[PDB]
Amino acid sequence: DRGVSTFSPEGRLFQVEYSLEAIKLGSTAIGIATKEGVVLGVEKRATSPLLESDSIEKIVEIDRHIGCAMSGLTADARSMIEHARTAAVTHNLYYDEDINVESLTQSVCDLALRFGEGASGEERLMSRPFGVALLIAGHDADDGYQLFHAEPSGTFYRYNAKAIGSGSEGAQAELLNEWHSSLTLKEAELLVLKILKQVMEEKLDENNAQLSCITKQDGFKIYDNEKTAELIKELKEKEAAE
Amino acid sequence: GSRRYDSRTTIFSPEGRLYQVEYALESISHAGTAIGIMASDGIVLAAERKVTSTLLEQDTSTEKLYKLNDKIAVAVAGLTADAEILINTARIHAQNYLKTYNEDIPVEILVRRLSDIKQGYTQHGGLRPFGVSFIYAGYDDRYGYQLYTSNPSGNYTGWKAISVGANTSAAQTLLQMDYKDDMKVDDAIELALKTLSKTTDSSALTYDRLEFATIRKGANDGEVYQKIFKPQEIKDILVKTGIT
Amino acid sequence: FRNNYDGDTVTFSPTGRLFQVEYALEAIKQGSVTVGLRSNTHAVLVALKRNADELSSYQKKIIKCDEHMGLSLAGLAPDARVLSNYLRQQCNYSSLVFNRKLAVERAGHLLCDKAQKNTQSYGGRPYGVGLLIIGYDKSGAHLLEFQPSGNVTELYGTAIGARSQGAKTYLERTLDTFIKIDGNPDELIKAGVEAISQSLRDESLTVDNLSIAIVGKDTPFTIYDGEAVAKYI
Amino acid sequence: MDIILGIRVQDSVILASSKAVTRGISVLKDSDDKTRQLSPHTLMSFAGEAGDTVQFAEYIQANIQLYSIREDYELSPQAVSSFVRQELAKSIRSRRPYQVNVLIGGYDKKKNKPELYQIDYLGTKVELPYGAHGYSGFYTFSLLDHHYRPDMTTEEGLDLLKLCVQELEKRMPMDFKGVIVKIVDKDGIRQVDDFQAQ
Amino acid sequence: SDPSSINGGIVVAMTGKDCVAIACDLRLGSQSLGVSNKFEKIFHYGHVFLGITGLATDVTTLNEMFRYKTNLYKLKEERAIEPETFTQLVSSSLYERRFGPYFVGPVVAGINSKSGKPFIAGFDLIGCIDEAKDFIVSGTASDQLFGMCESLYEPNLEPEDLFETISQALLNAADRDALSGWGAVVYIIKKDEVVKRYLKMRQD
Amino acid sequence: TTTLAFRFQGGIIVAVDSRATAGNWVASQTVKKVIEINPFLLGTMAGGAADCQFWETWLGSQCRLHELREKERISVAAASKILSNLVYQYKGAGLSMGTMICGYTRKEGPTIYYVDSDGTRLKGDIFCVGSGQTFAYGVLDSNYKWDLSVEDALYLGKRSILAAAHRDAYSGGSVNLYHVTEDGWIYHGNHDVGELFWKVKEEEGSFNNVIG
Amino acid sequence: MTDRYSFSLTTFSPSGKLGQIDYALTAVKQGVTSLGIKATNGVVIATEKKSSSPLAMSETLSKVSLLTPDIGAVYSGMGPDYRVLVDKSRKVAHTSYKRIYGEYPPTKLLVSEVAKIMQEATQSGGVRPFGVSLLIAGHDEFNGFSLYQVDPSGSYFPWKATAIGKGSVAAKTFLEKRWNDELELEDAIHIALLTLKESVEGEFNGDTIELAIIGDENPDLLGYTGIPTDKGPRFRKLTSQEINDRLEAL
Amino acid sequence: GYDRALSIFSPDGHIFQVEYALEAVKRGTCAVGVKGKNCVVLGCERRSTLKLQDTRITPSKVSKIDSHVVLSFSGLNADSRILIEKARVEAQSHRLTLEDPVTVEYLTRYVAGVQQRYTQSGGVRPFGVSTLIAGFDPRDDEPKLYQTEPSGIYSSWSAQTIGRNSKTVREFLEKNYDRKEPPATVEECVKLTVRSLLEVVQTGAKNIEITVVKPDSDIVALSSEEINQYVTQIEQEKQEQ
Ligand SMILES: *C(=O)[C@]1([C@@H](O)[C@@H]2C=CCCC2)NC(=O)[C@H](CCF)[C@]1(C)O
Description:
It is classed as hydrolase. The structure is cut from a larger assembly and holds eight protein chains of eight kinds. By secondary structure, chain D is of the alpha+beta class. In chain D, 33% of the residues lie in helices and 33% in strands. Chain D starts with a strand and ends in a 7-residue tail after the last strand. At the B-G interface, α1 and α2 of B face α3 and α4 of G. The structure holds the ligand *C(=O)[C@]1([C@@H](O)[C@@H]2C=CCCC2)NC(=O)[C@H](CCF)[C@]1(C)O.
């Protein structure tokens, strides 16, 4: 056949590019970074009315100052989350301090290219790349609030705002116009809720969508349905207002 | 690299079937038929010897009936050499159990383990599966007489009567037709011979083309006894049951 | 043709080529441009950081390997991290065991050797990144160009990445000039930014888009980004 | 060592085990239960090295519960004691052997008879009408050799044990803080909460 | 300290006219503490008998091992193992643990089912074979047993006579050993049948 | 060293001395012998300073990891067994630790586990560990009542350490107090034994054999 | 480097055939004919010494090999494969039997060992099956004389008489006509020579034929005296001269 | 030694071996689970390609992982055994180290992780199995029902079905299950489960097996009669109209 770590004639790794395709088919996830914190929202996208929507966990805590959202083959993200949590806790045990958001991200991204059937560089025992992308958001004393996009390519970019998943190209264009360096946390919340509503196949409500944020003061929190339901109601009103 | 020559023995077909298992079963369908029938007072194992010659030494031969334990035996359908590999490890698992608990191994425990070995060749390792199907006849003090079957996939099930190898479709219909819960070992012995007699791809059904065994609890004793009939013993039971 | 001989790095084509290696090289060309040049007292690295969105950051393209050495990358970022990390360890080993700073020429040899292994063995893949290494050791300023093929070359200046040919011809012209910019870092950098602007087209180097690094005589390899490079735009 | 006694009467097995846990100069606990239920009708008591004792007991407990679930059946007391003997027989020749002695008391629901097994850390197993580990046998065996009868009732067994414990409390130098007693029969395992004065 | 003096016990085997006998005490102690009076040290696999003295945990383990090995042997060979063959199996199984041996003193007794010839053999803890024609002793009272046997024994005794001899050798040797006694069992073995008798002896 | 922990109506009292000695040398009179595993869990340290400090801090890391994984507060039973099992893996290597793992969960209520390097893990109501333990036990055993007030319980614990600090050459310096509630532990100060002794002597009338 | 062929080279085809085994059998068919006949007091195995050149010294190449002092083997198919199989068979007879029980393995068990080795080359990773069929003849106290055939698949079966290779079909037919359960060893040898003659194209003498028997104990081939229970090997290769003597009575 | 990547990405972003693993599940006998207000029921169908089996000894479709948790599945039987054994082992380990039996979600997350792992590990193919794991968390009375599939994905359901014709029975459950008023009784819950199976089993008294799980390790499997009775009462609900 053909190696799993083969280069295309254009200088790209096939398995990584094909990986990105699976991620496009995933549920939408959006993140907005502001000087008041970072918001992370996702589309639950349940496949049947009998499925209990709250058992859908696409936003998870890495540490008190770091949270993350996923999109794509979500089962693939468990070991990544695990590695991330271990890395953050381990750092604290060794240095009696919080791990920087960028370092935590760089560590997760180090697993990315560790795949193949015997690549001469160490012992990358993983048959294929991860089929999921992540938005790592958090805060640390040196670089304040931060949002990162970690891809199966091992590369991670920092963004002021970013959307991944099925409605990403559309949602990203929206974030381009809506984002400005002075957004308040509340504005970011509604803004994420609004973009999810535009790209979601279903009518956004507090059950098929979920919000969360991380602030220096209270750390990472996942908004409970009631809190989000109100924000949704508030969004509809400001929209119908003009 | 080597990848080029890898057949990939452990993958799914677009229909969710395991190529090699399916092909191994196909292989087994050309193997001499083996039958298992469980009665109220015992179990009967009968199998047809595939290919024979005037010069073949039948007295010293055994290609289908093997003793695993003093209380468990199996009838083989498939590659004999593959079968012996599995039979040997099964014989060892039985003794490990005996040494650990000081009790003979329950029949299902042994069957499940052997089936698990088979299942392994199905999910990892890149090796071909064993081209073998077993009918297990045994006795333990929890379920008494038991009859099981395992094939290349590693799946196993229990039966009152069953067959493996060639013409199982035909053989099964005949068994389902004349089997009765209150049967007796002698009835079962007769049913087995009749069934093989009708499904044989050969002219007649002679003794030199058969292997026969019974697991009974000889009333005048109280313990379980396995009997692997000898050429002459098969020849006899063959005339008696009216097949001469 | 090609299609039958480019499935892995352990296969020579009928003409003696190694396509997987060549395809890897193609990843460099697709990479953002970066320039390197030196005088007799300093070595400078100027790299154009590329951004994904206008909401994204401009990915760092320069990594410090030791107080006297560092490099710029063009291509797969992860591979640059792996290679620079290896370089950091080799620099470290030299210091701890021999109390000796690693010679830039030695580093080049080590990188060549590490990359070569990933072009003759089944299962692995060539590195898909280009590197420009600058340093100041016991023989002065040095600039090295590293290619995934494992080929490493010492130069007075050069550039890799998209449209790199622009800056390269410029430097091959400005040679006699900048090679004498001794004792004056600001000049060397300015000359570096002039070589790099020769590969622009899309936009123009901004503040959060330009990245500069320098090393030399009494200057430990340091990286300037943002405001710090403003005085060069 | 601690007190570990066992007595197999007509229809049950009784295990008496000291409650004290002493560490050096101080008695740290006086309500310690040196026992683990391996299955509904099988109890194991133990004494020996400080940490090995419980770690071993729980390890055996885990293995038997796993067997119970897998087979949906309860191994006979004889089978369980053989499993335990083999674990200890491997342990004695390992890098760091488990220094634990045990008594396995179980009610065989198939044979409908109680059974008592004594096994030391070397993997030495024996089946007995009554047994003990440590110095306990030295003070109590002469009493059991005398009063023991195969047809004893659970009640008679408890009285015979009480006599043993009294001899232990009179002649033994250490204060083992009384014993916890447990009965194993056709209906399972139960604790005699009233032995502090029975 | 000495593994072969913790539990106590003895075993003795003898040859006679077309017969063999093997006997053992029933004690199992913990140094000076008697623990069991029902610890038999004689086992059999088919028509081959094995007596084992020494550390009890190893006596039990070895028995379980040889039961395991002779069971597989029968399944492959399709015949029961013979005395001569089993002796080799015992020997190589023991030597396999040359530098971490089982602390036992095995004794084999049986009649070859094909030649009818009587057979007995002894082993040291690492497999060295002693194939005696007259008798074999083992255990904490082996010195006493040698004294008893070297005097009481004589060739070609009939089964009923060998019984009296083997028993008197066992019994009187055990009564001079603090770690032996508490009962005794004697096996009289012939081509066709085998009789097992429990003896009456002091219980101190 | 003298460390103690006891269960009562108001939760748990944890008291320790603060002396460190190597032979007859008093290395310090201000050492911490209580590790704040996390806001809800406390660990006491007796024996080897390094061993207790290192593994009890590591325990905290394991507890945190558990809570991120199970989105639920770890039980004292589970927290103590993580330490116990770790320590047991090292049995024979020379670790030296006598410790108390203390917590207050909704599921268990006030809980104290004694865990040492021998691999011993004991759940209990009262524990004292260290060369001064016997002294603290005398004071605790005769004044302990489940119905003690948080105020009295705190004093009892402080008094018990004082008793040991006085008689035991290896105990002293100061007393560190803690109160463990279901909502977390509450630090109750550092009390220099020097000053505390005289104060308690006067106000209490005890330590009559000492001239003041 | 490193053998990276950890997957089977023999696998099932849609029809249920194991190609590599079939092909191995095909190689056996092209091989020179070899046969075996069991008598009441012995067994004989023979084959043709197909000298690949007159310059080659045929003696320096034995197709009939002694495995144990009471067991011998012969084959048809790929000689190199047979040669290594003999080395392995001689070794397993020791490691898996003589070193355990202090006596040589009985014919059926050694055959079982050989068979296992062959079965493994049918499933283990990175190998091809052995391209040979063996005929093992031996004797052991509790089983008497026996003759077995082992095929590339690892399957084996006991025979009264049989042949393998080139003209097996014809040879088997000829053996069925002359075999009976009362043949003495000499009769079997004679029958062997007659059967082998039909398969030989050129010269047929004691220099072109190789023949061995499993018969009585040869105390003269032991090498020492002093142990009553050691009477000598039952395996004996016939000499060129011994063969010719019997060819005149052909 | 064998570490070939069998589960890899294809151009469109799919992992065919995981995809085909699902096809194996669609082929397996149907399984369903519905949670009541105080219990969870698990029903499975029994094939009939061959009939003459010994029901006593033939492995049942619902397996106990611990005394308070059960697992059913659709797909390759041989494959399920491996997961069942691992789950049982993990259940005992968890009790040994945490001193508490596993929650249903924990046990589910474990099985799912094992499945995910077999989708990106060299030399192994994914499990051709999907599972339904039900039970009650220790000292809890709220019913739990989770489902896992070859990819390693899992979630909880009020009711769910897997296997052949599960499309059909799911519809039934979607328009016959009210989260507002879940089957408030073991009886009406078992009924809803048998009703849903009859939509695809086509008269099979001996082709339908039920298992009821109640709080505090109260687990029991119904007998042919008990079930046959439910069938009978249901066919009348139809005819009486
Ligand atoms: C008390 O246990 C001791 C303390 O020094 C350490 C120091 C810090 C916290 C843990 C306890 N440990 C000792 O070894 C020492 C002498 C014992 F004889 C001590 C003062 O008692």
